[PDB]
Amino acid sequence: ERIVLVDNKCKCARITSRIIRSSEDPNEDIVERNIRIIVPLNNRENISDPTSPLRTRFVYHLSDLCKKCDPTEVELDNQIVTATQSNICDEATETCYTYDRNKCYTAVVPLVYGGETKMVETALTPDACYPD
Amino acid sequence: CHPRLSLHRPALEDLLLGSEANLTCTLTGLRDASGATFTWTPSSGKSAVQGPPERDLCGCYSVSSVLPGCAQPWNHGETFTCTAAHPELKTPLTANITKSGNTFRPEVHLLPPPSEELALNELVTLTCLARGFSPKDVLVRWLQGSQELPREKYLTWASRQEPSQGTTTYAVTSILRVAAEDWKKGETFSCMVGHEALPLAFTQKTIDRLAGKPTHINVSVVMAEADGTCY
Amino acid sequence: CHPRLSLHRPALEDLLLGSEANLTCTLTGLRDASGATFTWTPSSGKSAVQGPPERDLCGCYSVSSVLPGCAQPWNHGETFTCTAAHPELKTPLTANITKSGNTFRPEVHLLPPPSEELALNELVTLTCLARGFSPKDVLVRWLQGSQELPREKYLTWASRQEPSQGTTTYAVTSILRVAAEDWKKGETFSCMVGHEALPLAFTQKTIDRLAGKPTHINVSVVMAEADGTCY
Amino acid sequence: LLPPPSEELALNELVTLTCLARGFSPKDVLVRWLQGSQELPREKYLTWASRQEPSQGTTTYAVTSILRVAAEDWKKGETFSCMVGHEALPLAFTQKTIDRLTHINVSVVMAEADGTCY
Ligand SMILES: *[C@@H]1O[C@H](CO)[C@@H](O[C@@H]2O[C@H](CO)[C@@H](O[C@@H]3O[C@H](CO)[C@@H](O)[C@H](O)[C@@H]3O)[C@H](O)[C@H]2NC(C)=O)[C@H](O)[C@H]1NC(C)=O
Numbered sequence: 001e002r003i004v005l006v007d008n009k010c011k012c013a014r015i016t017s018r019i020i021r022s023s024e025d026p027n028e029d030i031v032e033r034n035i036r037i038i039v040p041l042n043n044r045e046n047i048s049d050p051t052s053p054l055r056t057r058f059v060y061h062l063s064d065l066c067k068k069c070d071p072t073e074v075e076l077d078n079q080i081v082t083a084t085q086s087n088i089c090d091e092a093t094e095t096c097y098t099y100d101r102n103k104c105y106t107a108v109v110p111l112v113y114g115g116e117t118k119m120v121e122t123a124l125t126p127d128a129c130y131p132d
Numbered sequence: 133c134h135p136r137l138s139l140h141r142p143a144l145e146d147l148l149l150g151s152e153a154n155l156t157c158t159l160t161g162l163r164d165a166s167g168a169t170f171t172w173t174p175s176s177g178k179s180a181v182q183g184p185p186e187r188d189l190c191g192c193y194s195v196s197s198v199l200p201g202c203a204q205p206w207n208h209g210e211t212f213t214c215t216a217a218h219p220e221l222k223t224p225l226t227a228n229i230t231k232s233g234n235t236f237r238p239e240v241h242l243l244p245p246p247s248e249e250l251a252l253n254e255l256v257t258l259t260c261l262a263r264g265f266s267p268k269d270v271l272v273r274w275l276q277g278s279q280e281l282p283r284e285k286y287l288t289w290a291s292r293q294e295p296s297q298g299t300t301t302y303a304v305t306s307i308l309r310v311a312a313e314d315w316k317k318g319e320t321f322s323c324m325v326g327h328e329a330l331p332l333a334f335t336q337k338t339i340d341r342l343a344g345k346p347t348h349i350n351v352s353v354v355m356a357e358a359d360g361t362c363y
Numbered sequence: 364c365h366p367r368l369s370l371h372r373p374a375l376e377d378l379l380l381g382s383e384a385n386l387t388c389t390l391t392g393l394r395d396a397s398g399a400t401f402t403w404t405p406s407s408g409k410s411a412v413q414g415p416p417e418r419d420l421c422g423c424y425s426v427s428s429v430l431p432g433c434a435q436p437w438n439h440g441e442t443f444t445c446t447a448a449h450p451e452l453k454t455p456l457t458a459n460i461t462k463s464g465n466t467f468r469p470e471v472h473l474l475p476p477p478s479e480e481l482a483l484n485e486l487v488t489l490t491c492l493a494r495g496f497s498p499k500d501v502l503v504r505w506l507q508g509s510q511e512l513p514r515e516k517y518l519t520w521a522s523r524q525e526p527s528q529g530t531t532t533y534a535v536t537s538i539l540r541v542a543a544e545d546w547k548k549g550e551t552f553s554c555m556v557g558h559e560a561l562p563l564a565f566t567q568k569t570i571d572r573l574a575g576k577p578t579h580i581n582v583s584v585v586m587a588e589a590d591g592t593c594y
Numbered sequence: 595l596l597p598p599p600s601e602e603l604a605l606n607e608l609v610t611l612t613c614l615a616r617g618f619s620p621k622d623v624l625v626r627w628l629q630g631s632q633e634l635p636r637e638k639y640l641t642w643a644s645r646q647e648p649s650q651g652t653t654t655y656a657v658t659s660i661l662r663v664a665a666e667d668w669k670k671g672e673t674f675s676c677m678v679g680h681e682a683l684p685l686a687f688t689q690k691t692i693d694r695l696t697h698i699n700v701s702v703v704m705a706e707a708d709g710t711c712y
Pocket residue numbers: 046047048
């Protein structure tokens with residue numbers, strides 16, 4: 001529990017790791033890997049309202065949790081080159097399991113006002129859709 | 133014997149790390165090293181200086197030239213039209229070159245060291261494998277921490293084509309041997325690969341001892357009736 | 364034209380499996396026609412075949428022949444003298460070929476697939492690697508269970524030398540791509556390596572799943588009414 | 595006595611069982627095989643002759659024998675033994691160390707904690 005490898009929020013998973021080294025018998029140590037999953041028991045499959053029942057199957061692949069794609073800088077000889085860090089994040093299309101506390105989610109519903117119908121917008125997480 | 137005309141592409145290294153894409157144009161199979169004239173159809177910086185009539189089959193004549201000009205037109209798909217008019221033939225002949233289409237981008241993988249090589253505490257091996265790319269040109273560099281290692285500390289093989297799953301693709305490999313003290317201490321090592329089909333022209337993979345096979349795994353699954361917001 | 368230095372030893376791909384060892388030694392330098400002179404100082408019942416010439420640097424020719432003497436004189440230490448003669452200058456640099464000494468063994472590792480390719484259900488890839496052997500001759504074959512795969516399913520690079528500390532050594536790799544259903548069934552695969560400094564001329568390594576499995580697993584399920592998540 | 599290899603439990607055709615006897619001074623020895631409760635004929639297994647075992651100090655011997663049974667019945671859980679006789683043993687007795695076939699621990703904690711993370 002010391003160094004954070006990933007803290008992902010679309011799937012809400014967190015993975016840390018730590019080397020704890022014995023001094024006697026220097027040929028064998030132990031390397032620890034901790035995983036924490038939080039399962040939402042009341043979310044839908046797609047995130048809109050009328051979609052489908054409760055999501056009842058939750059699938060986590062380690063190679064898609066730890067995936068890192070925002071570019072980086074490498075200095076080769078005397079040059080700064082921009083490199084990518086992953087093979088697989090072609091643009092979204094990822095299915096998220098939870099909401100994210102700093103992004104806000106809306107829906108569109110038709111209602112009537114005597115004559116014709118409008119295109120009323122509706123907040124789904126009200127703490128984060130405040131316009132300011 | 134026989135005189136022919138051949139045309140080589142620019143090298144990968146000065147196209148990516150630099151931009152100076154000097155070209156070349158080679159005919160071989162003559163024996164009179166004074167008469168040669170070359171001609172390109174686009175020539176604005178036209179001063180293409182010819183090279184030395186160097187050695188050949190037991191000291192015969194073989195001459196080439198170089199057209200300077202950097203890498204903006206080559207990426208957009210221009211064409212170049214070197215022709216020769218030497219006096220040992222009765223014909224001017226021509227070939228051409230173009231940045232090729234039908235390309236695929238490689239898949240890079242770093243492999244952690246073997247377990248049996250770590251039990252001896254001398255030196256450990258890292259392997260870099262890049263695969264599935266359509267031209268025959270690639271680069272491989274290595275880094276320690278954020279410091280690039282010098283080129284004489286690692287061995288890189290050549291680029292060859294792999295068995296056919298329909299269309300032709302290629303492969304390459306590379307190894308690097310480091311001390312078994314700073315692997316276990318926790319330094320980081322990177323393998324970088326450069327190729328023409330990748331969008332930013334470079335891609336990187338980094339590994340260290342924490343990002344490998346662990347010995348212990350702790351799994352904790354928490355069911356939450358409260359909310360689905362993931363604080 | 365000018366005489367040079369050339370060497371040709373018996374083939375390892377027929378020396379470890381069969382007993383069809385053929386010696387063929389070289390000494391070239393082409394100015395005159397057939398003025399043929401030999402050195403086969405053991406000639407104990409062998410008849411040297413000669414044939415037609417083939418293509419060279421626009422006019423020149425070169426000659427050689429074959430002795431089938433596989434009665435174990437080569438891995439004993441006979442010196443098998445090679446020395447030309449002609450109506451020309453009697454000053455050769457000579458060739459004297461034998462089984463060489465100061466030999467080292469290879470050390471072979473077989474690597475598991477990367478976990479990115481597993482979670483896609485396509486072909487997966489394996490890697491063989493051998494390094495540290497003193498002459499640069501080696502054979503690499505693959506197996507599936509007990510069946511030797513045909514040698515057009517896999518790619519093998521050449522044999523190159525390493526950066527080192529005094530003593531010189533060599534290395535070689537190869538790959539084999541199999542289907543993910545065969546991996547996830549439980550079928551095994553193997554890499555075989557042949558070399559002449561090994562006492563039994565072959566080594567094997569084998570891989571499947573359940574090879575680098577971890578030995579400790581903790582699973583805790585936290586129910587409702589007990590959430591205690593920290594930020 | 596030894597449990598079967600893993601690779602015989604893959605195609606599930608037949609299953610072989612090895613009986614090893616090691617290190618005695620007088621070089622006359624018998625081996626008898628049995629499944630369940632009844633003993634077997636001498637023509638239903640293969641047994642070797644005894645040769646002097648290489649060892650430091652004094653000279654002793656060794657012998658081996660194998661027998662191949664089906665796969666599904668060893669998945670069922672039948673029982674074997676290997677009755678090796680001798681001269682210098684007070685009853686000339688057997689060894690029946692055989693099973694049909696992982697360390698597991700399961701706990702439930704009510705966990706009255708004052709305050710922790712998860
Ligand atoms: C999950 O549910 C949401 C909500 O229905 C899906 O998003 C929306 O899906 C609709 C249905 O095709 C798309 O409709 C389009 O709406 C525009 C108006 O903005 C209209 O002019 C078009 O003619 C079309 O009907 C819409 O693009 C889409 N996205 C929004 C509103 O942002 C979503 O696709 C669902 N995801 C999955 C994987 O099912």
